Amino acid sequence: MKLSARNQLAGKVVSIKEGAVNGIVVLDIGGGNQISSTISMDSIRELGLQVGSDAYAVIKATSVMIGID
Amino acid sequence: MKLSARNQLAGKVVSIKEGAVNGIVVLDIGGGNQISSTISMDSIRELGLQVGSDAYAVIKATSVMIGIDD
Amino acid sequence: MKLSARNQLAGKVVSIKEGAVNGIVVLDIGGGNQISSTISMDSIRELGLQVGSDAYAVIKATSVMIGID
Amino acid sequence: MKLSARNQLAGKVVSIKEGAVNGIVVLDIGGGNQISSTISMDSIRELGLQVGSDAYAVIKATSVMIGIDDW
Amino acid sequence: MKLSARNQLAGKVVSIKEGAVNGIVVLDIGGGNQISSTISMDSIRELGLQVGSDAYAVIKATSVMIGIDD
Amino acid sequence: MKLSARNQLAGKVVSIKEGAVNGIVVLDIGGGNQISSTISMDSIRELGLQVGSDAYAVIKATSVMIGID
């Protein structure tokens, strides 16, 4: 599928924290940056994610805030 | 403040699209990646954002989905 | 791409209201249900959406509340 | 209460997966579609939800993305 | 309707900024605190919101971040 | 950091329910209102949250719905 979400950042899975109904996936997206994603365990299983998998961090623009020092 | 949001990514403002009550800020966070943020125009003014400003893209972990190739 | 979002509902575009930076797309997903989506105008153009387009309403499970009478 | 959320879709609870502080509720909203919801266990209990309960999937318009096949 | 959203804060409408497809509603919830809401212009009209209207700010718990000083 | 989030509500922590990857923090912001926040356990620990902590409820404007009687 092609998605409206303005942010679709390729990266490699660095870690997966398995929980009860959710888990947290950490992706290395390059440039020294990592992104953490809290999603359903069903989705982690259905996408076959494991440490080392290639994936994307997907974020709708209305979910992104801006901060300054 | 220090925020619980797991994602706080430093970058430089590449463009700002001004709208009616919202605008869209694009940040270059390095590594060839950019992040687009849709926030209120009031916040854009109050934070003093301009093209070239140093800023952060801040994203709660529960807002991030994972994708894989087809 | 394939997405973790638990909700990916097929439907056809019934209307698009254009704004300044955002627009509102209404999708008929059948069975008398319609979904309204508020997204960037850039995405609306990039996905080539028009009245009648086939599309999907995509919703992260953590964005769905449950209500009762 | 009347809510601003543009999406308020009636359906029946088909399943509830209990987690630690959250659970996942699945609603059959008709037309062969289901909606899955991740909400607090406290709310699942307070709303008295069970398999067979009548409910609504409530989604703010700004939370809905659009996808296409792109073929 | 009854909603699972764990946050439902009564207040009075102090201001409405109209936009193109969205507007921004500000509620006085008391104690010197205000809540700003970015919602569709359709909802603002359909709910009959005006300066002075009694209303509620409704927020899903997964939408709330926690911050601290320093 | 300074954040674009239009809602930054001072309060004191009255409860913490720990989960597997998330926990739920309840902040009393005065006037008889309490705000519940579902965030990662990592964040709860990293912010040093305990009953009695001074903190802020931070909410993006696009996450706030309006309801009426």
Author numbering:
A (entry chain D), C (entry chain F), F (entry chain B): 1 to 69
B (entry chain C), E (entry chain A): 1 to 70
D (entry chain E): 1 to 71
Paper lines:
Here, we characterized E. limosum Tub, a tungsten storage protein. Tub has a sub-nanomolar affinity for tungstate and contains a single TOBE domain first characterized in a molybdate storage protein. Crystal structures revealed Tub assembles as a hexamer composed of a trimer of dimers, capable of binding eight tungstate oxyanions at two distinct binding sites located at inter-subunit interfaces. Tub enables E. limosum to accumulate W and then supplies W for two tungstoenzymes needed for conversion of lactate to SCFAs.
The X-ray crystal structure of tungstate-bound rTub was determined at 1.85 Å resolution. It consists predominantly of β-strands (59.1%), where the C-terminal half of the β1, β2, and β3 form a three-stranded antiparallel β-sheet. The Tub dimer is formed by another three-stranded antiparallel β-sheet consisting of N-terminal half of β1, β4, and the β5′ from the neighboring monomer. There is also a short α-helix between β3 and β4 and a 310-helical segment between β4 and β5. Tub has eight tungstate binding sites, where two (type-1) lie at opposite poles of the hexamer with a cavity that is open to the surface. Tungstate binding involves H-bonding to the backbone of Ala20, Val21, and Asn22 from each of the three monomers along the threefold axis. The overall structure of the type-1 binding site is similar to that of the molybdate binding protein, ModG. The six type-2 binding sites in Tub are located at the interface of two adjacent monomers by non-crystallographic twofold symmetry producing two binding sites for every dimer. The type-2 sites are buried in the interior of the Tub hexamer with no direct connection to the solvent when tungstate is bound, which forms a complex H-bonding network involving the backbones of Arg6 and Ala61, and sidechains of Ser4 and Lys 60 from one monomer, and Ser40 backbone and sidechain from neighboring monomer. This binding site is very similar to that found in Mop and ModE.
